[PDB]
Amino acid sequence: GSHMNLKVEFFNAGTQAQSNSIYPKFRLTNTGSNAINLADVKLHYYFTVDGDKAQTFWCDWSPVGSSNVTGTFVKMNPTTTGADQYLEIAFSSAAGTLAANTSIEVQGRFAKSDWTNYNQADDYSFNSSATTYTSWDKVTAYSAEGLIWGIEP
Numbered sequence: 001g002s003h004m005n006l007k008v009e010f011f012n013a014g015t016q017a018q019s020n021s022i023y024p025k026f027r028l029t030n031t032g033s034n035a036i037n038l039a040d041v042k043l044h045y046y047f048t049v050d051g052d053k054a055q056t057f058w059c060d061w062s063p064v065g066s067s068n069v070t071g072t073f074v075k076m077n078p079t080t081t082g083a084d085q086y087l088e089i090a091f092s093s094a095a096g097t098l099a100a101n102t103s104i105e106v107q108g109r110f111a112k113s114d115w116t117n118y119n120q121a122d123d124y125s126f127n128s129s130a131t132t133y134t135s136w137d138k139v140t141a142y143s144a145e146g147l148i149w150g151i152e153p
């Protein structure tokens with residue numbers, strides 16, 4: 001009612017269909033009056049891997065300190081349209097809190113260990129058109145309570 005006031009905006013920094021990397025950019029805004037503990041916040045980006053390989057996420061920049069933002073990859077079960085895996089982004093305790101009526105960006109890439117290609121065009125979370133942050137319900141966010149933003153596939 002006031003404890004999940006996290007607005008999530010998103011775009012893709014690189015929009016090549018055949019791409020050796022995926023470039024998620026999130027903007028998270030605390031739209032409420034109470035601080036949000038980022039250590040409890042998770043984000044998901046859903047996609048089809050187009051050839052499963054070990055993957056790595058890098059956060060290149062966030063105001064909270066890029067080293068405090070990490071990613072792991074999970075398989076969808078069962079798989080569904082546009083989604084056989086997701087990236088899950090997490091924040092460490094050193095990321096701190098997100099103050100009332102403030103926002104932070106989280107800018108990351110991910111790639112396969114052998115740098116082989118993805119097809120972005122079929123990915124559930126991919127936005128082929130946005131060039132700026134946009135309110136996007138095809139990425140999800142979570143608190144300790146569970147889902148707080150978006151539509152899971």
Ligand SMILES: [Ca+2]
Pocket residue numbers: 047048049050118119120121122123
């Ligand atoms: Ca794909």
Ligand code: NI
Pocket residue numbers: 001002003004005
């Ligand atoms: Ni609430």
